[PDB]
Amino acid sequence: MINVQNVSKTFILHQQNGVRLPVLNRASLTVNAGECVVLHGHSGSGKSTLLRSLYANYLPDEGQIQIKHGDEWVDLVTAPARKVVEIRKTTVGWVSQFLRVIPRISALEVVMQPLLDTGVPREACAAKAARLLTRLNVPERLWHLAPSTFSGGEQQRVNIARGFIVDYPILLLDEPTASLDAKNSAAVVELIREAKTRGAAIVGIFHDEAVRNDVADRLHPMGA
Amino acid sequence: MINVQNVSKTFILHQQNGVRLPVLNRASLTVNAGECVVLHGHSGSGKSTLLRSLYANYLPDEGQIQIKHGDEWVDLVTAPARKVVEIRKTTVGWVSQFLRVIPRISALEVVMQPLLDTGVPREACAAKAARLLTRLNVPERLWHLAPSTFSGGEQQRVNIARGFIVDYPILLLDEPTASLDAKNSAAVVELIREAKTRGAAIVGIFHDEAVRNDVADRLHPMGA
Amino acid sequence: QPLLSVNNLTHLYAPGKGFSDVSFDLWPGEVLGIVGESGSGKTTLLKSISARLTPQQGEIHYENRSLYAMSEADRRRLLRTEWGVVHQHPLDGLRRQVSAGGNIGERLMATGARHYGDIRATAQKWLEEVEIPANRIDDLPTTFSGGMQQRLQIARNLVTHPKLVFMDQPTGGLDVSVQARLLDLLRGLVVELNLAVVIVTHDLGVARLLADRLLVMKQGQVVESGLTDRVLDDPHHPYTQLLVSSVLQN
Amino acid sequence: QPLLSVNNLTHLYAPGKGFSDVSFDLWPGEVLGIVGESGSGKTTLLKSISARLTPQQGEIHYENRSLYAMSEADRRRLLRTEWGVVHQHPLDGLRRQVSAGGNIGERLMATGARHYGDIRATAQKWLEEVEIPANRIDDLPTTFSGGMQQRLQIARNLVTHPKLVFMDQPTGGLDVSVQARLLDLLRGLVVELNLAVVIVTHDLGVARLLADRLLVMKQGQVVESGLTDRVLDDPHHPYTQLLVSSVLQN
Ligand SMILES: Nc1ncnc2c1ncn2[C@@H]1O[C@H](COP(=O)(O)OP(=O)(O)NP(=O)(O)O)[C@@H](O)[C@H]1O
Ligand SMILES: Nc1ncnc2c1ncn2[C@@H]1O[C@H](COP(=O)(O)OP(=O)(O)NP(=O)(O)O)[C@@H](O)[C@H]1O
Ligand SMILES: [Mg+2]
Ligand SMILES: [Mg+2]
């Protein structure tokens, strides 16, 4: 359950004459359990800005982004950093185009880690990571090697597996399937649909038409 | 004048069980002054590998990439590192999607530097850099600020200006116009055509159909 | 409740030299990175919060106990058993005339260890953890290289499984491979053992991969603070924007 | 003809400690970065080629003159006038009891400077070059921070406009902003003044932006060498591939 009310963000670039670059103006968005909302708009409409504000990666200047944490409601715009850290650890999951990981950790442990942080047993985490990698057709030979030594597509299948290792009540998807071929894309679509079925509030940004049509349950116009 | 004979390259990935990944097999390519050759092939055919071998960024295992330097002929596959460094400084220019620069140097000096390295007066270098930036419609306000503080498109217009600051007899173009809009793309096309007219041997990799048709004078099939 | 609390802490050698009006809370199982300009007072603040520099103003509370209101014996006990300190220069946190094994084992014996074989085995295990060969245990740190000495200091200050570790540029002098090893080790300690780390670093990549929260210091004042990725990707204070724009992209 | 030539140079404290069979040529106006594992012998090689460590085998020729066949007076003259040495720890290359102005001016006076005002002005100019405030010229290096001391050492070893500079991790202890300033300064010196630099670094980004050629050292032997970007993007030796795979991506 996501509740965005009057969130507005303008970047102040002090490095260049302190010019103001508005990217969000009184935006709002409501998301419910078992629903997928995809942000649609011309490039530069604030899609990325809003999505990462939902993940607290950006800080809107004004407004509220209230997300249910546990059985609570938390305004990420004013919550303490510890609150946001826990909300990410348990409540708000993120999938994107980039595997920011420690370089020398094997792929299986890169996928297991976010679940092991929650205290889940290591056997269950390993089994779920193996399952996710197999579904995303990641070769077994690459499970025990660092992602940095793989190709871009394999690194991204690993990042998607790491994103889906934990069953987050809220989920964010910044073009997960973009580069993937049709088979791997379809696998990610099936994973997203399963997340929706279990009751995951999914917010996504998709460029592919077929992926959006198959996944999106509602469209939010970010043009304004 | 470029002369590629029997160049073959296979990557050995010791980090992953030492698997071999062939990407070039007995490839050859002849380029003459005042000609543009574009590499065409399915993704993974060795286009990038060959282009960067032409720039000495990769080292083919076997074969020859003989380029005219001064009034000489130099096999980049066996030349000393100093030879390659000078060949890049004066003979073989490179344009790509990425501005690897020192962070805190203004855009005008990022564009001027490759020409100032050749001993050209600072007034001439500044004038030519200003001309190139104006042609690529880079705002005047951004000339005197570091590229890292700009957007991706402006950073790439600056990288293209830096690439074209020196009139290289050989030129390499790894998708310069890819992200650019139609106006800025057309400007880069005009610059490439002018380089061809002066007698520049251009080797390019292009994804856009219109750009390739307008620029390409010959097509090299990299599928094999 | 915070493992460490700092309120209005200030120490100035002279106007503008040091830190002033610094407050922050650190909990178990999280990392508070400190980044800033060379000369912003990061090291002075680290010394002050690590019981090595009495502040002129403000208070420091560790487990609800004022740090500098305690007896000197109690502070030394903290620094001897449950506090780790990693200096920027490894030799400052090492005994030059004592072997690496002795340097690691001093802390263990200070915590009650009295079995020579077990201390030796633990020292060798920690040397292998930081990838230092176990055959260098008897060699004095003067024979070690800068990175080797830094890793030896890290092992010395981590062998006791401390609850709070203050580090000043621990990655300095380390090749990227052993650097990644150290980052993984620190992450594992923080998550599994609930370790708390206050790390001063200039490599913003290490702060991104390790620090859970960040402080950005300039001319002796904290100019920006908050979530690490928010600060790095959504900086607000001019200095922070300069700082992240100066990063060398790989 | 090479400014510096190294042929079969070897210095070993013990089997595997040091460097062995090292040869390379350095010309004016280029940078030879050295990267490798902590413990590969980079510092030992730097000392040996900088006239600070007599080798057991091989020869070093500077302007066609064997380095260690010359008299000790000539080597000291080289290190005093036209050779710069930047140590990993700045205080090792600084006079603790001498102010920053004095530290910078020692080299200038060693080159014949005998005007106090001009020496002071040059020292202040170089302090501003490394962004150190000119009001800290009279302060002893002990009052400087690690980055401040490192920049002071760099200015001290660059004030004389030397022809060859051996640096050991000059970027260590430097925030990314002053690091970029230093990189630009070194590039400008190398290109305009034809300066030659042998730099040992672990930040592969700095080697990418600065080094024209690279050496990759492991267990005391050079394992891979060639063009910097070719080595980084097209590594061949297993160690190099590990090393560049361990880089923290920003
Ligand atoms: N013992 C001292 N006596 C007088 N002034 C000092 C002393 N130590 C530091 N100063 C100053 O105090 C300021 C901050 O010191 P310090 O905390 O060590 O800086 P820093 O931020 O850690 N720099 P760096 O190590 O490069 O990241 C600097 O201007 C120092 O020059
Ligand atoms: N004085 C010494 N006596 C005996 N052995 C030494 C001595 N100095 C170095 N060794 C060893 O010589 C090897 C290489 O030394 P050194 O050249 O300083 O390494 P390095 O590559 O510079 N490491 P780092 O500073 O981390 O990048 C190391 O195993 C050192 O432990
Ligand atoms: Mg410091
Ligand atoms: Mg060293």
Residue numbers in the entry:
A (entry chain K), B (entry chain L): 1 to 224
C (entry chain I), D (entry chain J): 3 to 252
What do the authors say?
In Escherichia coli, the 14-cistron phn operon encoding carbon-phosphorus lyase allows for utilisation of phosphorus from a wide range of stable phosphonate compounds containing a C-P bond. The crystal structure of a core enzyme complex, Phn(GHIJ)2, revealed a symmetrical hetero-octamer consisting of a compact, central tetramer of the PhnI and PhnG subunits each interacting individually with the more distal PhnJ and PhnH subunits. Here, we show using single-particle cryogenic electron microscopy that PhnJ mediates binding of a double dimer of the ATP-binding cassette proteins, PhnK and PhnL, to the core complex. ATP hydrolysis induces drastic structural remodelling leading to opening of the core complex and reconfiguration of a metal-binding and putative active site located at the interface between the PhnI and PhnJ subunits.
To capture PhnK in a stable, nucleotide bound conformation, we introduced the E171Q mutation in the Walker B motif, which is known to allow binding, but not hydrolysis of ATP in ABC modules. We then purified the C-P lyase complex as expressed from a plasmid encoding the full enzymatic machinery (PhnGHIJKLMNOP) using a C-terminal double Strep-tag on PhnK and in the presence of the non-hydrolysable ATP analogue, β,γ-imidoadenosine 5′-triphosphate (AMPPNP). Structure determination by cryo-EM single-particle analysis at 2.1 Å resolution (59, 737 particles, C2 symmetry) revealed the core complex bound to a dimer of PhnK in a conformation reminiscent of the ATP-bound state of ABC transporters (red subunits). At the interface of the two PhnK subunits, clear density for AMPPNP allowed for modelling of a nucleotide in both active site pockets. Inside PhnK, the adenosine nucleotide binds in a very similar way to what has been observed for membrane-associated ABC modules. No structural differences are observed between the C–P lyase core complex when associated with the ATP-bound, dimeric state of PhnK compared to when a single PhnK subunit is bound (rmsd = 0.3 Å). Remarkably, this structure also revealed two copies of an additional protein situated on top of the PhnK subunits, which we could identify as PhnL by mass spectrometry and inspection of the EM density (yellow subunits). The association of a PhnL subunit with each of the two PhnK subunits thus generates a double dimer of ABC subunits, both of which are in the same orientation with respect to each other and the core complex and thus potentially capable of nucleotide binding. In this hetero-dodecameric, 327 kDa complex, PhnL is in an open ADP-like state with no visible density for a nucleotide. In summary, we conclude that both non-transporter ABC subunits encoded by the phn operon, PhnK, and PhnL, can bind simultaneously to the C–P lyase core complex in a double dimer conformation with PhnK in the ATP-bound state and PhnL in an open state compatible with ATP binding upon closure.
